[PDB]
Design a protein around this motif. Structure first.
Motif, PDB file in Angstrom:
ATOM      1  N   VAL A   1       0.911  -1.128   0.000  1.00  0.00           N
ATOM      2  CA  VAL A   1       0.000   0.000   0.000  1.00  0.00           C
ATOM      3  C   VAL A   1       0.958   1.186   0.000  1.00  0.00           C
ATOM      4  O   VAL A   1       1.755   1.351   0.930  1.00  0.00           O
ATOM      5  CB  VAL A   1      -0.843   0.050   1.289  1.00  0.00           C
ATOM      6  CG1 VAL A   1      -1.698   1.323   1.298  1.00  0.00           C
ATOM      7  CG2 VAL A   1      -1.714  -1.204   1.399  1.00  0.00           C
ATOM      8  N   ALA A   2       0.903   1.999  -1.046  1.00  0.00           N
ATOM      9  CA  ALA A   2       1.796   3.147  -1.143  1.00  0.00           C
ATOM     10  C   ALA A   2       1.056   4.467  -0.974  1.00  0.00           C
ATOM     11  O   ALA A   2       0.069   4.554  -0.240  1.00  0.00           O
ATOM     12  CB  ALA A   2       2.519   3.121  -2.483  1.00  0.00           C
ATOM     13  N   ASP A   3       1.557   5.492  -1.657  1.00  0.00           N
ATOM     14  CA  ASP A   3       0.977   6.830  -1.625  1.00  0.00           C
ATOM     15  C   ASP A   3       0.659   7.312  -0.213  1.00  0.00           C
ATOM     16  O   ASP A   3       1.532   7.314   0.646  1.00  0.00           O
ATOM     17  CB  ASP A   3      -0.285   6.876  -2.491  1.00  0.00           C
ATOM     18  CG  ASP A   3      -0.617   8.280  -2.953  1.00  0.00           C
ATOM     19  OD1 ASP A   3      -1.755   8.742  -2.713  1.00  0.00           O
ATOM     20  OD2 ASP A   3       0.267   8.916  -3.561  1.00  0.00           O
ATOM     21  N   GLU A   4      -0.584   7.721   0.027  1.00  0.00           N
ATOM     22  CA  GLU A   4      -0.980   8.223   1.344  1.00  0.00           C
ATOM     23  C   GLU A   4      -2.390   7.801   1.730  1.00  0.00           C
ATOM     24  O   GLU A   4      -3.176   7.379   0.887  1.00  0.00           O
ATOM     25  CB  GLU A   4      -0.937   9.754   1.363  1.00  0.00           C
ATOM     26  CG  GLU A   4      -1.975  10.388   0.438  1.00  0.00           C
ATOM     27  CD  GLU A   4      -1.966  11.905   0.474  1.00  0.00           C
ATOM     28  OE1 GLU A   4      -2.425  12.484   1.485  1.00  0.00           O
ATOM     29  OE2 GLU A   4      -1.495  12.519  -0.514  1.00  0.00           O
ATOM     30  N   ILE A   5      -2.689   7.929   3.021  1.00  0.00           N
ATOM     31  CA  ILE A   5      -4.001   7.625   3.583  1.00  0.00           C
ATOM     32  C   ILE A   5      -4.255   8.850   4.448  1.00  0.00           C
ATOM     33  O   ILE A   5      -3.759   8.926   5.574  1.00  0.00           O
ATOM     34  CB  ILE A   5      -3.999   6.412   4.536  1.00  0.00           C
ATOM     35  CG1 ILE A   5      -3.171   5.253   3.972  1.00  0.00           C
ATOM     36  CG2 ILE A   5      -5.436   5.990   4.799  1.00  0.00           C
ATOM     37  CD1 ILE A   5      -2.843   4.149   4.976  1.00  0.00           C
ATOM     38  N   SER A   6      -5.017   9.808   3.932  1.00  0.00           N
ATOM     39  CA  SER A   6      -5.285  11.043   4.670  1.00  0.00           C
ATOM     40  C   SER A   6      -6.642  11.624   4.318  1.00  0.00           C
ATOM     41  O   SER A   6      -7.353  11.085   3.470  1.00  0.00           O
ATOM     42  CB  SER A   6      -4.232  12.087   4.314  1.00  0.00           C
ATOM     43  OG  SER A   6      -4.458  12.563   2.994  1.00  0.00           O
ATOM     44  N   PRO A   7      -7.015  12.745   4.966  1.00  0.00           N
ATOM     45  CA  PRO A   7      -8.298  13.405   4.705  1.00  0.00           C
ATOM     46  C   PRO A   7      -8.427  13.803   3.236  1.00  0.00           C
ATOM     47  O   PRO A   7      -9.510  14.163   2.780  1.00  0.00           O
ATOM     48  CB  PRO A   7      -8.258  14.609   5.643  1.00  0.00           C
ATOM     49  CG  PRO A   7      -7.529  14.067   6.819  1.00  0.00           C
ATOM     50  CD  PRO A   7      -6.383  13.319   6.170  1.00  0.00           C
ATOM     51  N   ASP A   8      -7.313  13.748   2.506  1.00  0.00           N
ATOM     52  CA  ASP A   8      -7.310  14.065   1.076  1.00  0.00           C
ATOM     53  C   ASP A   8      -7.787  12.839   0.286  1.00  0.00           C
ATOM     54  O   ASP A   8      -8.337  12.964  -0.806  1.00  0.00           O
ATOM     55  CB  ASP A   8      -5.893  14.411   0.585  1.00  0.00           C
ATOM     56  CG  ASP A   8      -5.655  15.908   0.447  1.00  0.00           C
ATOM     57  OD1 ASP A   8      -4.726  16.286  -0.300  1.00  0.00           O
ATOM     58  OD2 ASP A   8      -6.377  16.708   1.087  1.00  0.00           O
ATOM     59  N   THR A   9      -7.560  11.654   0.844  1.00  0.00           N
ATOM     60  CA  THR A   9      -7.917  10.419   0.161  1.00  0.00           C
ATOM     61  C   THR A   9      -9.003   9.587   0.840  1.00  0.00           C
ATOM     62  O   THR A   9      -9.258   8.451   0.447  1.00  0.00           O
ATOM     63  CB  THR A   9      -6.657   9.545  -0.020  1.00  0.00           C
ATOM     64  OG1 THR A   9      -6.079   9.274   1.265  1.00  0.00           O
ATOM     65  CG2 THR A   9      -5.627  10.272  -0.871  1.00  0.00           C
ATOM     66  N   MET A  10      -9.636  10.152   1.858  1.00  0.00           N
ATOM     67  CA  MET A  10     -10.696   9.451   2.572  1.00  0.00           C
ATOM     68  C   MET A  10     -11.843  10.408   2.816  1.00  0.00           C
ATOM     69  O   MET A  10     -11.632  11.604   2.964  1.00  0.00           O
ATOM     70  CB  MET A  10     -10.229   8.987   3.955  1.00  0.00           C
ATOM     71  CG  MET A  10      -8.914   8.241   4.027  1.00  0.00           C
ATOM     72  SD  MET A  10      -8.597   7.790   5.748  1.00  0.00           S
ATOM     73  CE  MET A  10      -7.687   9.211   6.336  1.00  0.00           C
ATOM     74  N   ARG A  11     -13.058   9.882   2.846  1.00  0.00           N
ATOM     75  CA  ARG A  11     -14.204  10.704   3.184  1.00  0.00           C
ATOM     76  C   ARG A  11     -14.428  10.274   4.627  1.00  0.00           C
ATOM     77  O   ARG A  11     -14.566   9.085   4.906  1.00  0.00           O
ATOM     78  CB  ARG A  11     -15.421  10.386   2.315  1.00  0.00           C
ATOM     79  CG  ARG A  11     -15.372  11.044   0.939  1.00  0.00           C
ATOM     80  CD  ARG A  11     -16.752  11.116   0.315  1.00  0.00           C
ATOM     81  NE  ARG A  11     -16.734  11.739  -1.007  1.00  0.00           N
ATOM     82  CZ  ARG A  11     -16.302  11.143  -2.113  1.00  0.00           C
ATOM     83  NH1 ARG A  11     -15.851   9.898  -2.067  1.00  0.00           N
ATOM     84  NH2 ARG A  11     -16.315  11.793  -3.267  1.00  0.00           N
TER      85      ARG A  11
END
Ligand SMILES: Nc1ncnc2c1ncn2[C@@H]1O[C@H](COP(=O)(O)OP(=O)(O)O)[C@@H](O)[C@H]1O
Length: 238
Positions: free
Chosen positions: A192-202
């Motif tokens: 799992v790369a990139d990011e997990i943030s408020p930018d990518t999650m609702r």
């Protein structure tokens, strides 16, 4: 290490982050303050990269703790992340617990309605074609990945969902949906790369259901960064 890596020219620069080279199997990810939507909507808000880098590092750590293999190495305040260099698979993996976004737009789903099960959607990451949704046959025919990989990706996505959903729920947050990206490291491992943030999650507040993710920016709902900070606070990162 030797943070002046920043003085170099980014291997790749996108709409929200910059990938700097550190060596053969590691990169430095810079979470910039750029925030985008549509990307016909843009702005630079102080503290965005800081908050997303901070949230993302914590979530990756939590995933790693539950057995999910990620590209995360470590967090370097305020907005940097040391990650394992991977070759990204051009697919945006979207997991949905509550109907929202395009799902409600493209099909007769009621907004905010709880889905019978986590829906997994694979979108082709290709600007020229407008990131069209894919089905397994299409993805394989395009040569994006093998069937075995696509299914492994789905398995990883659902595992990520169970871990994150439980976590946010315990912090009074409803994980509506999220988008992750997967890449292969030098050894061919799916991470799992990139990011997990408020930018990518609702993310919605459990009680009021106030929006805490990038949707407040794209829909001008209020202080996006102040809501992003609420997420940090809820996760005990501040
Ligand atoms: N560990 C990694 N190795 C190599 N590149 C990565 C890694 N993680 C994420 N990336 C790439 O960094 C970019 C992220 O930039 P943004 O976040 O600017 O994406 P856009 O590039 O906006 O989709 C993506 O193209 C993503 O594939």
């Amino acid at each position: 290490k030797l943070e002046e890596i920043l003085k170099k020219q980014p291997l790749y620069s996108g709409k929200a982050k910059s990938i700097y080279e550190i060596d053969d199997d590691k990169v430095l990810i810079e979470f910039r303050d750029d925030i985008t939507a549509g990307g016909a909507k843009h702005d630079v808000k102080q503290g965005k990269g800081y908050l997303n880098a901070l949230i993302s590092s914590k979530l990756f750590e939590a995933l790693e703790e539950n057995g999910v293999k990620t590209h995360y190495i470590k967090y370097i305040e305020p907005r940097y992340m040391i990650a394992k260099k991977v070759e990204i698979i051009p697919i945006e993996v979207i997991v949905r617990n509550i109907a929202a976004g395009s799902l409600c737009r493209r099909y007769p789903f009621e907004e905010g309605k709880e889905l019978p099960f986590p829906i997994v959607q694979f979108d082709y990451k290709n600007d020229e074609y407008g990131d069209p949704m894919l089905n397994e046959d299409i993805a394989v025919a395009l040569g994006l990945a093998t069937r075995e990989e696509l299914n492994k990706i789905k398995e990883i996505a659902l595992k990520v969902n169970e871990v994150l959903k439980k976590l946010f729920d315990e912090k009074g947050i409803i994980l509506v949906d999220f988008k992750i990206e997967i890449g292969k490291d030098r050894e061919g491992n799916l991470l799992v790369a990139d990011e997990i943030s408020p930018d990518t999650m609702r993310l919605w507040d459990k009680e009021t259901r106030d929006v805490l993710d990038k949707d407040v920016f794209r829909k001008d709902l209020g202080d996006v960064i102040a809501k992003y900070r609420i997420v940090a606070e809820r996760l005990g990162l501040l």
